[PDB]
Amino acid sequence: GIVRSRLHKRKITGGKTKIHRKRMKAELGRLPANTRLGARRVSPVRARGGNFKIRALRLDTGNFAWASEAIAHRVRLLDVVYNATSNELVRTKTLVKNCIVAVDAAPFKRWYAKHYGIDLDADKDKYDVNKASPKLQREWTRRRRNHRVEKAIADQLREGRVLARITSRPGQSGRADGILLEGAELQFYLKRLEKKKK
Amino acid sequence: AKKHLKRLYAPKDWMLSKLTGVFAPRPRPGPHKLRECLPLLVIIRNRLKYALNAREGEMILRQGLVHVDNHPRRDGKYPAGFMDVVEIPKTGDRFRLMYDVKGRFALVNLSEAEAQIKLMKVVNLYTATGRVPVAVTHDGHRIRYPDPHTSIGDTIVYNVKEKKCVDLIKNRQGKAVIVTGGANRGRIGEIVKVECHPGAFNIAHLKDASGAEFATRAANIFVIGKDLNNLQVTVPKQQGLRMNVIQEREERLIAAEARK
């Protein structure tokens, strides 16, 4: 079937390799997952050695990490907004590694409020920051005195959806984990998204 | 996955005649490598002569009458390589597998409190789950908590009966070593220097009792004592001293003449 050998490739001299053996199972390839945005659906694949690769055909939620806060939360995937390979992978809503998506910022807002006692939504089921005991209030000031948040991230949390980058391979792991875009990476991709709308 | 081993492809140290058969007992995976092991069938049939053939060797072995490292082995394809203590309690054999100056395997007879002791060369060190320091030796043992001073290349003295380490000999200059592989296999000398080549094979230069300098790759040396006199294990008859070939020939001729 599909192979990953160099027999079919032309030599650097331009010559044609004369193949003198049949194809092997140790050099096979397999059809891509083409993971889409939808309700979760996966298929196991028996890889070499007896192990299993979870070929994910659709995924909707995943583990997205706030790296500067060293935390992670399981959120819903709302959209895929940018792909470096092509924009057809954005039209078809294909989830691949290093693709830019928009996720649900409510868990991150709630964790920020619970950890630092700062409510982003207030200044513009939900946690109450005035209910906290005054031992926790002393805890909040100790945490708050070292840490400052970025306005670009804070604006996205208030809006309800925050951009993120997929850091897992869905066609191999079967899951769509990621990281929130921060710093110069966020400003790089935001500029690309503004070019499309104009 | 190969199951067979031709007699021509078998190691020469097994001393299997090319006309006796086409095949040789292929060593099963285990403690020692296929090229650096002596199968239990070979030991019990071609060395001890207890079994006249493979059938009788199997009858001996499958009863658990042969103990290797204080554990009965029923397999005639068991590797049973260097430093291994093989004991037959019914005949009280109790010999250790070593190398002689010619490089061939030798059965050095032991006693009590010596058949309980086995030397192991640490070939790897790694931290296992739970932050447990584990040392892997030349025979496949994984020591769960070795000496804190253990390093790759040093040897440990293992009590096979109690399954515990009793001493550690570091691989330093001046230590007594036996050569385990190569052209100088079986020779015993003291480390005089170890040329270290990062990324490549280190070269240990050794000098034996007679003062003959010889070198070998550092992976072929095995520390056996703190000095060339204070060895921690008994060695074969020649004491790891290579003899000049001409002198050996004349001595053998003189002995043969004196016999008659």
């Binding site: - | 021509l8 090319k18 006309l19 086409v22 070939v245 001409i246 020939r249 004349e250």
Partner: protein, 183 residues
């Protein structure tokens, strides 16, 4: 198929098939030593050629060479025990001077004839091939048996032969059986 028993050749034919001098010398040797064919002479020639080639290779090397020392000692020993070379001469250059008669003297047939167990060299071959000669209490039936100097003393008639401690041969056995038939 899958047999590893080794075998080689021991003789080689001469380059020129018809030389008068070579044919005359070979007929001299054949008549003198009672040989069935020229192939025995050619076998002796091949052994001599191998010995002389080894001696030349050793003599090329320096004296202090360990290979020269060991192999020259071995070839000296072999020549001295097999009687090809006199014990007085012990240099490596005396092997090069060996000749075909030197080895042809050491054959069991020639040794028997010289020792007197046979009246002729053609009588000796028959005596050996007929299981009558025993070297060191072992019956030897091969005429080309090269005799060592230490084994020269022990050559005698076999204990199982009629010319010894054995029973009478066919001529007498058959005559006795015929006499029993008549009686």
């Amino acid at each position: 198929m899958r047999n590893y028993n080794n075998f080689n050749r021991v003789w080689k034919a001469p380059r020129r098939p018809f030389e008068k001098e070579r044919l005359d010398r070979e007929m001299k040797l054949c008549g003198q030593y009672g040989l069935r064919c020229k192939r025995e002479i050619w076998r002796v020639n091949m052994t001599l050629s191998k010995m002389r080639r080894t001696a030349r290779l050793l003599l090329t090397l320096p004296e202090n060479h360990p290979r020269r020392l060991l192999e020259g000692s071995a070839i000296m020993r072999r020549c001295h025990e097999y009687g090809f070379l006199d014990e007085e001469k012990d240099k490596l250059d005396y092997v090069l001077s060996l000749t075909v008669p030197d080895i042809l003297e050491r054959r069991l047939q020639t040794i028997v004839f010289k020792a007197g167990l046979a009246k002729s060299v053609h009588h000796a071959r028959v005596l050996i091939q007929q299981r009558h000669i025993a070297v060191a209490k072992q019956i030897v039936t091969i005429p080309s048996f090269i005799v060592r100097v230490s084994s020269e003393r022990h050559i005698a008639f076999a204990d199982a032969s009629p010319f010894g401690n054995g029973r009478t041969g066919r001529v007498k056995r058959v005559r006795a059986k015929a006499a029993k038939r008549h009686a």
